[PDB]
Design a protein around this nucleic acid. Structure first.
Lengths: 100, 88, 116, 65, 49, 51, 65
RNA sequence: GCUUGAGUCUCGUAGAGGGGGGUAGAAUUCCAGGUGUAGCGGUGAAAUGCGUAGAGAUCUGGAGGAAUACCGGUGGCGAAGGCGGCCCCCUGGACGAAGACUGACGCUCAGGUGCGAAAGCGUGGGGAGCAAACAGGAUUAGAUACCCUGGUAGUCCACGCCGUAAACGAUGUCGACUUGGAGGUUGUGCCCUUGAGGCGUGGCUUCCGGAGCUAACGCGUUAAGUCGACCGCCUGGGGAGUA
RNA sequence: GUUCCCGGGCCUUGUACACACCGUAACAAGGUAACCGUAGGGGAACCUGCGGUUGGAUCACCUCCU
């Protein structure tokens, strides 16, 4: 219903087992009335400051039109999933697709 | 705030038009229904020292709204409270 | 001793005391020098010439380790911060990089109560 | 004066951060209004984007940690 | 009209009147300090060219 | 008419820059307003078909 | 903050430290907060800086000397 | 009954606005370990204290607590007080393009009620930094004062009471009226927004001034100018904003 | 040569002064800026912490970039 730009990062060591993680979350969006606009994938880019041991996390983007109550519980999933350490949801009304 | 898909319902009922939300029988309803949607705010958290003035504002504008409807036509007045239920 | 070339020289000129200390890249301290131990106790503790002698005290008794390219990382915006740097360049060193990693809080704790 | 807020109408994004790098420095500092002639609208929009990128380690906070 | 870079694409007529004005003030100076005739007349030939 | 066929980069000059854009040269970069676009152009009155 | 200039220098040149902050962070975290005080001297300062602009506007019309 | 008053709806906007909670990072204090010196702190100067039971200082790791540098801008929100990191949940106030309506439903107001910085106290947690009472060294004729080493209430969070102020651009509140420029800040309409613009329409706020007022300073479209409406206040100060 | 020093003069800045410079608390920046509110203490003025305001002073020099 509303637009939520869920941008998140997993660790470079989880960059090899993250595609399974992607199918996890996107399947849930389809089971929660939703449609993806851009599965933006850059790669494992260098972090400015290493997080307690290593830098270079892996960035993956959603930018999905989805209901606020399911994404809320979805954010709880991210919060207690230790691969995805930094994950935030953005503004509504417009989720983009370009600039990659 | 009063969500839009509750608002449009209320306006088309009380009013003849869908834009007829300026008639007192509708002005008061959307004000009361706005507080009915605001109950979820003053029921929890309790310390809204800013939203406090907002309540006093819209409800006072309603006390005098019902004031003139009272003095002009007691038939539609008792009808406003008989179609929504904003007396008590 | 310990054999180090890159000596992280933290020079902390606060307000009325300037401390110069070269440490190891890892962290093993090498030798220190202060505006208060070389003498100059007073408004002289707040002078860059005292900081120049502080650099000189941190120039000798440290050749036992033998640093050349040193990371003079300056802390605390104080009196010296250049007289001390050129004291080291005229001491026989080659400062590979002068960094400004001063003790910076994001206005974390409150500042201290002093001066009037 | 600048050609980023002229040919760049409507909210400057931050996926590719190269444009915010025109408005920050190589230290991690944010450029002030008086240098590049850029009215606050564009200026504070960049502001929102920047805070977000630093939380996600795209942009650094200070120089060194 | 200087040349875009650091040179002169100008009508070097200016670079010519330049010397004319140089030598002009020169002989008037040789009136003030009163220099010998053979050289002020040498300047006559100079402003002449 | 006067279309562009191929583009030609060409040095411009410090003479061509104002003090207002000598501040933006210390920020943005050197090769931004240093070289201009003086490409190969089709003079007025010439038609053609690139083959 | 971090200046290097390879190896031909024989000079410090901490000119970026000053172009960063230097005394910037210090002005607020050296002596007690006082909260409202700096605000006061901000008004006085502006009154004399804007008057400097009024000064630049007063000299343009005559200054016949 | 009719509208130039108030107000509502459809479509959008920015933010230190408030309540509850979670989280990231630096620095200060302390503890343990690697290293090492003979000094650290501070002041106009000095000194108590710490220290050879290896302090101050640096690096790695860790447990608490308070507060958010740069961005910062007589910038922003708000009735006011007051309030700067980010986000989630609930949600308020202000404003604008183009239309539809009830048809003055508007304003203020003693007794009253609510909000009410900071601080004090009762209670459950708590303590890095600073700091009433107090101990010590001195400038001094003296120090219960400037300064410094320690340190309790407190500072912080939640529930109440006291319900106090320079709660002061000292400018009470709503509406109407009155040549402009530089700005700052937030939207929209129109035109080649081709490009960092031009011409209008509202809110908040700053400086220079005209009409006007005043003792003067100066305020000046946000007025100390011109009116209507409502409440409170003064009749020399001290005594006393007290018993 | 006017920065050092003794005297004179012009302009400017500030004053609750003009009767005209037991402890100095305010008025010069009173050499610790002032004032109101809250709590506590001290022979006494007031002091310390916190919030706010202008019924406040100088924005004069010494070193670095075209």
């Amino acid at each position: 219903m509303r637009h939520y730009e869920i941008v998140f990062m997993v660790h470079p060591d989880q960059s090899e087992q993250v595609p399974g993680m992607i199918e996890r979350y996107t399947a849930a969006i389809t089971g929660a009335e939703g449609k993806i606009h851009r599965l933006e994938d850059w790669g494992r880019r260098q972090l400015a400051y290493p997080i307690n041991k290593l830098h270079k996390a892996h960035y993956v983007l959603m930018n999905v039109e989805a209901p606020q109550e399911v994404i809320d519980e979805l954010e709880t999933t991210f919060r207690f999933n230790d691969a995805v350490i930094r994950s935030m949801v953005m503004r509504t009304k417009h989720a983009v697709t370009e600039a990659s | 705030s009063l969500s839009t898909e509750a608002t449009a319902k209320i306006v088309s009922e009380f009013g003849r038009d869908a834009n007829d939300t300026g008639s007192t029988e509708v002005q008061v309803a959307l004000l009361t229904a706005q507080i009915n949607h605001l109950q979820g705010h003053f029921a929890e958290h309790k310390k809204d020292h800013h939203s406090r003035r907002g309540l006093l504002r819209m409800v006072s504008q309603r006390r005098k709204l019902l004031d003139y409807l009272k003095r002009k036509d007691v038939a539609r007045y008792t009808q406003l409270i008989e179609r929504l239920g904003l007396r008590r | 001793r310990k054999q180090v070339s890159d000596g992280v020289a933290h020079i902390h000129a606060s307000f009325n005391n300037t401390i110069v200390t070269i440490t190891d890249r890892q962290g093993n301290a090498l030798g220190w020098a202060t505006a208060g131990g070389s003498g100059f106790r007073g408004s002289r503790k707040s002078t860059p010439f005292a900081a120049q002698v502080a650099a000189e005290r941190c120039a000798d008794a440290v050749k036992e380790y033998g640093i050349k390219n040193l990371e003079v990382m300056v802390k605390g915006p104080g009196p010296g911060r250049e007289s001390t740097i050129r004291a080291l360049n005229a001491a026989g060193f080659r400062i590979t990089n002068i960094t400004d990693v001063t003790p910076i809080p994001h206005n974390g704790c409150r500042p201290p109560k002093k001066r009037r | 004066f600048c050609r980023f807020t002229a040919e760049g109408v409507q909210e400057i994004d931050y996926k590719d951060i190269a444009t915010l790098k025109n408005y920050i420095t190589e230290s991690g500092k944010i450029v002030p209004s008086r240098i590049t002639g850029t009215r606050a609208k564009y200026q504070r929009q960049l502001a929102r984007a920047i805070k977000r990128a630093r939380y996600l380690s795209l942009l650094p906070y200070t120089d060194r940690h | 009209v200087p040349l875009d870079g650091g040179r002169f694409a100008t009508s070097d007529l200016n670079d010519l009147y330049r010397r004319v004005i140089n030598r002009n003030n020169r002989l008037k100076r040789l009136l003030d300090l009163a220099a010998p005739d053979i050289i002020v007349r040498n300047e006559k030939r100079m402003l002449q060219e | 008419g006067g279309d562009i066929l191929v583009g030609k980069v060409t040095p411009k000059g410090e003479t061509q820059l104002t003090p207002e854009e000598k501040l933006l040269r210390a920020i943005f970069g050197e090769k931004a307003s240093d070289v201009k676009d003086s490409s190969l152009r089709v003079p007025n009155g010439v038609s053609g078909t690139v083959i | 903050i971090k200046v290097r200039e390879n190896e031909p220098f024989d000079v410090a040149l901490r000119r970026f430290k000053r172009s960063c902050e230097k005394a910037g962070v210090l002005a607020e975290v050296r002596r007690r907060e006082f909260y409202e005080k700096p605000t006061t001297e901000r008004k006085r300062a502006k009154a004399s800086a804007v008057k400097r602009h009024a000064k630049k506007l007063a000299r343009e019309n005559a200054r016949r000397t």
